[PDB]
Amino acid sequence: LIPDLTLLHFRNTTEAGATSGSRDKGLHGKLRAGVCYSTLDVINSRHQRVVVGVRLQQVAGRDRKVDIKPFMIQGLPTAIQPTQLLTENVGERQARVLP
Amino acid sequence: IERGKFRSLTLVNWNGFFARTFDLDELVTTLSGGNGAGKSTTMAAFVTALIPDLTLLHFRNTTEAGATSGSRDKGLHGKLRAGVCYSTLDVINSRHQRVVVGVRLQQVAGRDRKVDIKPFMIQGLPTAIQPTQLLTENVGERQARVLPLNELKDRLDEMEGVQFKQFNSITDYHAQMFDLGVIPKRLRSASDRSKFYRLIEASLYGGISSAITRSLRDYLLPENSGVRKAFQDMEAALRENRITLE
Amino acid sequence: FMPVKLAQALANSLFPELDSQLRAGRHIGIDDLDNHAFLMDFQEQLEEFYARYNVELIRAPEGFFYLRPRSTTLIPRSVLSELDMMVGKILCYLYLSPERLANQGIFTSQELYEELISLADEGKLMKFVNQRSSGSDLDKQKLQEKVRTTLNRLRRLGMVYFLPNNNNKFTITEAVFRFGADVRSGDDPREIQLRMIR
Amino acid sequence: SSTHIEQFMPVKLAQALANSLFPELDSQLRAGRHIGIDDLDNHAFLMDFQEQLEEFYARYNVELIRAPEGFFYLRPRSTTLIPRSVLSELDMMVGKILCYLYLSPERLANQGIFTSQELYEELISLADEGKLMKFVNQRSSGSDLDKQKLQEKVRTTLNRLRRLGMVYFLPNNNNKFTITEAVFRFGADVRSGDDPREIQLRMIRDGEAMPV
Amino acid sequence: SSKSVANIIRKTIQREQNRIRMLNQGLQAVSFGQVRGVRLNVNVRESHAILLDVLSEQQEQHQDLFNSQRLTFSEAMAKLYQRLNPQVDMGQRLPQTIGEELLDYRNYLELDVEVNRGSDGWLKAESGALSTGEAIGTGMSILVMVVQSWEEESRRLRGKDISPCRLLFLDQAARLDAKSIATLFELCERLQMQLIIAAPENISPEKGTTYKLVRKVFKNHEHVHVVGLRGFG
Amino acid sequence: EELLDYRNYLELDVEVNRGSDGWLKAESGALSTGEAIGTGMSILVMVVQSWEEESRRLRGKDISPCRLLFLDQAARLDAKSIATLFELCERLQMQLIIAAPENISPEKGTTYKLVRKVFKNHEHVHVVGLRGFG
Amino acid sequence: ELVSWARKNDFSIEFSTLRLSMQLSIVANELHRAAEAAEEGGDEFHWHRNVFAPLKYSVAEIFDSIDMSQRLMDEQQNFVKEDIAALLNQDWQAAIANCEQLLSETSGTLRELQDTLEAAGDKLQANLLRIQDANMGSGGSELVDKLVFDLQSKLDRIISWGQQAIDLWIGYDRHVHKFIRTAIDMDKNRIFSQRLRQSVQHYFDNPWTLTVANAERLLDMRDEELALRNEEVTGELPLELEYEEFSEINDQLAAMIEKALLVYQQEQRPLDLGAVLRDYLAQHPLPRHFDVARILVDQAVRLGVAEADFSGLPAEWLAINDYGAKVQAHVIDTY
Amino acid sequence: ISLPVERLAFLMAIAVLNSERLDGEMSEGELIDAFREVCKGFEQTAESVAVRANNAINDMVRQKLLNRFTSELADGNAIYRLTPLGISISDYYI
DNA sequence: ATATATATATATATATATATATATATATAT
DNA sequence: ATATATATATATATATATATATATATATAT
Ligand SMILES: Nc1ncnc2c1ncn2[C@@H]1O[C@H](COP(=O)(O)OP(=O)(O)OP(=O)(O)O)[C@@H](O)[C@H]1O
Ligand SMILES: [Mg+2]
Structure with a gap:
């Protein structure tokens, strides 16, 4: 919903308003190596099926930093699910996430 | 050795509670009830009985735990009813001595929501005497009344074998409690009291208290005076050297 | 600089x-x-x-x-007795409007003494002199002497301007309003002052 | 020029x-x-x-x-804008004794750190025990209750002098203290080798010391 | 004097490290969420070991810093710490306070809390990288160790016949699941620790004593009615 | 500049009709956890409604922005408070995502059971879904 | 605890450095011999006769002797302080040289004792650590460790004092100089001292008092007296605690479902939540259906995972009864 | 040489603490605590704790049982050490 | 026609200094 | 013998300055 690194701080529920204590925002450790995606699907009052989303990547480096790229998709068929667009059903056991 | 135990917690004239005695468990005591039942009130009353330091007592909501809310009110005043209130603990010592520590709380008249607290201790009370009855006088038909500290002193002194003491400072109160195996650490200085309250406060809200983890060094490791003496010696040497150089 | x-x-x-x-x-x-x-x-x-x-x-x-x-005051601080504030509020009350027709800005120690006795409660008077006292001559004389002493203390503060002579007759300044209570819309000053004093 | 500090x-x-x-x-x-x-x-x-x-x-x-x-x-001065006050005679006794301890080598082992008990012992050694006690209470004749009263009075005077800077309590101890050179003022009547009765008049004239 | 200082700090640090390392084995693999164990890591800080070495052997080489009339001893120590080991990059804190901090031996040890999360080994415990239940369990473990240490320290002053009472709290217990609460119960009973827990629902029906409170409005005031509960009927 | 803003001229307070007593100013310290959580949700929906009202005049006349809120550690609330919250959200056509560690079982809406496991030496969340009950 | 022991008992009533060197040498020989004997090893009796009888008694006695020498030096320091104090009373300006010499000799003696102490402290510590290393050669050598832990501190303790005393004395010394630089410099002839003494003795023959500034204290307004709330609260006292019992119906249902479901794990049969739930919910009335579904799922998800969940193909919402109940789960294959 | 039961017990406690003391130094700040504890155990209050402690320490110092050293930084601004006679009297029983 | 480096603005949160309130010791005075 | 005044220390919350990291628009090398 809000792809801004400044504001995103996933502190623990305990210490909901307390100071940082550490320097990490807690987002990097929730991701996995590679390219990841977080997408919402919305149906407007106009009934337009819109897929909003963000591509996330653990920025390789000394610190635990994350790169976020927003995106929107419009006009998708109602029969195609988000997991299908972002994943290739290769013959292997597990699918492949595409950039 | 047999470790002492907290037998029960008694609440007098509290918000919602007139005179209620919860008998604690050897291992675990649980309190349930819908929102606003008054469990947090019981916890607050206990801790008030344990550390009656008014500067430390701050009953923030579990939400905003440690987040400054700027209410200017510690929340204790609204948890008491008008008139006298009591909060007492019965403890069985490892010497198998039943000791009733406690505090008399009373709202201070005025716009400020300020409270006054007076600790006290009772030793040698017969095991058949319940604090709930000990603190109340049966006036009228099944209409017991609460009695003030002076009346309690008169009633107890008239009994045989019971020793009642009233403390003019929470320091002596903590010292006596420690003497009877009720507190792990001797809270000689105000910093010790602050650390103790920090520990129980973190426990009550539960989980990683920021202050604790930030001062874990102070909380775990003991203070050493030899290092301080050596540093002072080096300081004096450096001061003399600077004097000579100047 | x-x-x-x-x-x-x-x-x-x-x-x-x-x-x-x-x-x-x-x-x-x-x-x-x-x-x-x-x-x-x-x-x-x-x-x-x-x-x-x-x-x-x-x-x-x-x-x-x-x-x-302040709490961190660098000037050695001190606190007025209970009788001092009581007497201050008495003078603040006496800074009254009928006062103009009563004493024309000049009061005497007897006025203050009678007002304090009649107006204050007996328990606080005993607390001032001593608890065990009960309406006696020596206790009343000591109370009068302490009243004179606190009047001198107020004079030191500029609250009361003595009329120049050994005899005790003085005037009350506006600064005495410090002892007074806040004024609301339509409130009778007499009523609020007495309610505070009680 | 104006707006210039040297003006005022x-x-x-x-x-x-x-x-x-x-x-x-x-x-x-x-x-x-x-x-x-x-x-x-x-x-x-x-x-x-x-x-x-x-x-x-x-x-x-x-x-x-x-x-x-x-x-x-x-x-x-006599025309002081700041009020003035004079030390008690007992204060003089303790100050003179304190000056003695500052100058006394017998107590050198103390290294300047003294306890009120030692001060009282020295005071009674050099002063007149009962006749000094007379001031503590007019009806004293060596009663131990009055003895404790004199000890308490000496302690109180020592505290007041601490307030005056003649003595410092130790950073952690209020029962031990270290003397300061200010105590030398208690000897201003004897620092000059002349007749005592002329030096007293000189001092009182200078405002150094009023009588009692 | 500087050499003697450095020596006494080193000895105290070694003694405290040994004590804490011996104490660590007083934990028995608590099960909280994916956290499988809690541990205390004590390690002498190299940034401070270098400082001790300089103090103990090379005090004179930096006398220029020590004997400056501008710097107090605390500030001198802070500046010396800045001089060597310059990559720490301390923040905006003033030299005076950081020096005063340097004057305490305990600061010289990194004292941190490690958790054996899942199968990732022992990782430093950060509230920002732990679930609510995991953090609650870790905090309880820390508090129990702290109270044990306090009891141990006072063992000398206290009489040989008295064991101090032990009691802790936990409000809003509903944040913990059944497994976590069972682990907490077994830990507390193994440590003879009394617990007072609160939750809107009775989360511990078959252990210890339980009470239920109901608040009733009654003639323009309130009353709380307390009813005991039992496991089976 | 503070005076130049009309909003500063207004004093805003949150009041609750707590029990037998009248309306009292909402102080975080004078309420239980559930009461504070509920009042917070109330004020949040107030804010959402106000924002929608403000933004309507700059939007297409036939656009109704989505409304969706969270509630973590919902177990702090009793069944009565949860039912009241559900009623409020329904009355306001507002979607809720509530997390509870199995303690509560809201019969209405969708429920998602999650369980963490190790599979192929990787952490995996087995997920099951239910809905329509009631 | 020793207070009661004492109460029931009812009881009541060589500074030469050559010495210190010779005790240190004797200690070195005995400690090295004991360390070598421990390192060589032996049976329990050999371990005893080589590390517990010889070491313990000898080291304890001679460390006590060294400590006794330090105490005798402490007595000598006290005596020299007293001698200096008495001398300054008799010569005043003429004892300055005597006191400076006495200070010089005492300082030199203290420094030589410290030097002799540190002449063997390090190597003795090394030998003691060696004995610590060799102690573990047997399981019954626990007591040895105590000595190897005890005989440490004493030694270090001794060395500590050897410096601490100097740290104290080098301090005290300064004061004496300060005294000479302050007490006697302005009272060279001491006449001021006698005259002060006579003034003290004959003060009240001319009682005089000094003048000091006594500025007034800033009188302040007393804060309002605090009055508590007194209302003589009365009310009904609570009755005896009632009791209620917890229903274990859900436990029985869970046991039923676990027994009914264990067959799938036993046979490793592919489990389909849709069909299983649809079949099983028919056995219960509609209002209970939810409380069943949940439980069943709780029991099913512990049994293996579903391989399709990694395919990226979402599962459908299969209906599991009338009235509109639905379930979304892939088939559980990998047990 | 005159050690009543209380003085003797205080001396024995001092010796025990010195034996268990790390570096073999005793500041008076701990001596006063030890005297308070022994007097509490013996259950006698002739005067205040402080005055009794001070009198006993001074008596032992003058009775050649303790040696005092003035150190301002030390807790109580003094450091006390057992004298050879005190060591002998203490270890005679211990 | 593109992507990286710069300058700008912003929120975060870190630290300091201030001011308040409470507890304590304890020294005075009746 | 105890009420009361006074000085000191600590914890706690407010307010302000400042360094850090990120987001956005423009400039300029590729
Ligand atoms: N200081 C106070 N002033 C006014 N009302 C108060 C105060 N403290 C508690 N209350 C009220 O008393 C009732 C019990 O509060 P309390 O926080 O003790 O409940 P609880 O059982 O802990 O609740 P929950 O489990 O929902 O947190 C609630 O109505 C609360 O609003
Ligand atoms: Mg609550």
Whole structure:
């Protein structure tokens, strides 16, 4: 919903308003190596099926930093699910996430 | 050795509670009830009985735990009813001595929501005497009344074998409690009291208290005076050297 | 360096006496024309000068100036007795409108004594003199002597201007309003003052 | 020119009065506190701007005076703008005794750290026990209750002198103390080798000491 | 004097490290969420070991810094710490306070809390990288160790016949699941620790004692009615 | 500049009709956890409604922005409070995502059971879904 | 605890450095011999006769002797302080040289004792650590460790004092000089001292008092007296605690479902939540259906995972009854 | 040489603490605590704790049982050490 | 026609200094 | 013998300055 690194701080529920204590925002450790995606699907009052989303990547480096790229998709068929667009059903056991 | 135990917690004239005695468990005591039942009130009353330091007592909501809310009110005043209130603990010592520590709380008249607290201790009370009855006088038909500290002193002194003491400072109160195996650490200085309250406060809200983890060094490791003496010696040497150089 | 106007105010030949009287707690009202005008002119700098002492230079709504010590006050602080505030509130009440027809701004120790006896509760009077006392001659004489002593203490503060003679007859200044209560819309000053005193 | 400090106050006096140390020093001085070499910061502050402060305080009709021993203090004049007060005779006894202990080598092992008990023992050694006790209570004849009363009075006078800077309690102990050179003032009547009755008149004339 | 200082700090640090390392084995693999164990890591800080070495052997080489009239001893120590080991990059804290901090031996040890999360080994415990239940369990473990240490320290002053009472709290217990609460119960009973827990629902029906509170409005005031509960009927 | 803003001229307070007593100012310290949580949700929906009202005049006349809120550690609330919250959200056509560690079982809406496991030496969340009950 | 022991007992009533060197040498020989004997090893009796009888008694006695020498030096320091104090009473300005010499000799003696102490402290510590290393050669050598832990501190303790005393004395010394630089410099002839003494003795023949500034204290307004709330609260006292019992119906249902479901794990049969739930919910009335579904799922998800969940193909919402109940789950294959 | 039961017990406690003391130094700040504890155990209050402690320490110092050293930094601004006679008297029983 | 480096603005949160309130010791006075 | 005043220390919350990291628009090398 809000792809801004400044504001995103996933502190623990305990210490909901307390100071940082550490320097990490807690987002990097929730991701996995590679390219990841977080997408919402919305149906407007106009009934337009819109897929909003963000591509996330653990920025390789000394610190635990994350790169976020927003995106929107419009006009998708109602029969195609988000997991299908972002994943290739290769013959292997597990699918492949595409950039 | 047999470790002492907290037998029960008694609440007098509290918000919602007139005179209620919860008998604690050897291992675990649980309190349930819908929102606003008054469990947090019981916890607050206990801790008030344990550390009656008014500067430390701050009953923030579990939400905003440690987040400054700027209410200017510690929340204790609204948890008491008008008139006298009591909060007492019965403890069985490892010497198998039943000791009733406690505090008399009373709202201070005025716009400020300020409270006054007076600790006290009772030793040698017969095991058949319940604090709930000990603190109340049966006036009228099944209409017991609460009695003030002076009346309690008169009633107890008239009994045989019971020793009642009233403390003019929470320091002596903590010292006596420690003497009877009720507190792990001797809270000689105000910093010790602050650390103790920090520990129980973190426990009550539960989980990683920021202050604790930030001062874990102070909380775990003991203070050493030899290092301080050596540093002072080096300081004096450096001061003399600077004097000579100047 | 130092503020220039602050240096001017401190250098003024009136500054030593006024400073001593302020550090003694005296209240400077409109009656002291020279001192009041000096404080009016140089307040913006004397407030800072006395804030350097962790004290506040306060100009009351009535107009009189005074020094309020903070908790970190650098000027040795002291606290008035209970009888002192009681007597202060009595004089504040006596700063009344019928007072003009009653005493024309000049009261006598007897007026204060009778007002204090009739108006105050017996328990506080005993607490003043001693608890075990009960309506006796020696206790009343000691109470009168303490009343005179506290009247002198107020004189030290500028609350009461003695009429010059050994005899006890004085006048009440506006600064006494410090003991007074706040005024609301339509409230009778007499009623609020008595309610506070009770 | 206008808006210029020299118009009203000398530059160095204004600098001294604007220093962070001025307020505590002024409050202590007006309270009657003597300043010795131990308060290094305050003593140095007084030394640097000593002349400005004597002339400033002269406006109050009080002399900022530095005794030859090197300790500053305030002596009000008969026309003082700051009230004045005199020490009690018991205060003189304890101050003279304190000066003796400062100059006494027998107690050198103490290294300057003294307890009130030792001070009382020395006091009774050099003074007249019962005739000194007479002042504590007019009806004393050696009663131990009155003895404890005199001990308590000596302790109280010692505390007051501590307030005056003649003695410092130790950073953690209020039952032990270290003497300061200010105590030398208690010997101003004997520092000059002349007849006592002329030196007393000289001092009282100078305002150093009133009689009782 | 500087050499003697450094020596006494080193000895105290070694003694405290040994004590804490011996104490660590007083934990028995608590099960909280994916956290399988809690541990205390004590390690002498190299940034401070270098400082001790310089103090003990090379005091004179930096006398220029020590004997400056501008710097107090605390500030001198802070500046010396800055001089060597310059990559720490301390923040905006003033030299005076950081030096005063340097004057305490305990600061010289990194004292941190490690958790054996899942199968990732022992990782430093950060509230920002732990679930609510995991953090609650870790905090309880820390508090129990702290109270044990306090009891141990006072073992000398206290009489040989008294064991101090032990009691802790936990409000809003509903944040913990059944497994976590069972683990907490077994830990507390193994440590003879009394617990007072609160939750809107009875989360511990078959252990210890339980009470249920109901608040009733009654003639323009309130009353709380307390009813005991039992496991089986 | 503070005076130049009309909003500063207004004093805003949150009041609750707590029990037998009248309307009292909402102080975080004078309420239980559930009461504070509920009042917070109330004020949040107030804010959402106000924002929608403000933004309507700059939007297409036939656009109704989505409304969706969270509630973590919902177990702090009792069944009565949860039912009241559900009623409020329904009345306001507002979607809720509530997390509870199995303690509560809201019969209405969708429920998602999650369980963490190790599979192929990787952490995996087995997920099951239910809905329509009631 | 020793207070009661004492109460029931009812009881009541060589500074030469050559010495210190010779005790240190004797200690070195005995400690090295004991360390070598421990390192060589032996049976329990050999371990005893080589590390417990010889070491313990000898080291304890001679460390006590060294400590006794330090105590005798402490006595000598006290005596020299007293001698200096008495001398300054008799010569005043003429004892300055005597006191400076006495200070010089005492300082030199203290420094030589410290030097002799540190002449063997390090190597003795090394030998003691060696004995610590060799102690673990047997399981019954626990007591040895105590000595190897005890005989440490004493030694270090001794060395500590060897410096601490100097740290104290070098301090005290300064004071004496200060005294000479302050007490006697301005009272060279001491006449001021006698005259002060006579003034004290004959003060009240001319009682005089000094003058000091006594500025007034800033009188302040007393804060309002605090009055508590007194209302004599009365009310009904609570009755005896009632009790209620917890229903274990859900436990019985869970046991039923676990027994009914264990067959799938036993046979490793592919489990389909849709069909299983649809079949099983028919056995219960509609209002209970939810409380069943949940439980069943709780029991099913512990049994293996579903391989399709990694395919990226979402599962459908299969209906599991009438009235509109639905379930979304892939088939559980990998047990 | 005159050791009543209380003085003797205080001396024995001092010796025990010195034996268990790390570096073999005793500041008076701990001596006063030890005297308070022994007097509490013996259950006698002739005067205040402080005066009794001071009198006993001074008596032992003059009775050649303790040696005092003035150190301002030390807790209580003094450091006390057992004298050879005190060591002998203490270890005679211990 | 593109992507990286710069300058700008912003929120975060870190630290300091201030001011308040409470507890304590304890020294006075009736 | 105890009420009361006074000085000191600590914890706690407010307010302000400042360094850090990120987001956005423009400039300029590729
Ligand atoms: N200081 C106070 N002033 C006014 N009302 C209060 C105060 N403290 C508690 N209350 C009210 O008393 C009732 C019990 O509060 P309390 O926080 O003790 O409940 P609880 O059982 O802990 O609740 P929950 O589990 O929902 O947190 C609630 O109505 C609360 O609003
Ligand atoms: Mg609650």
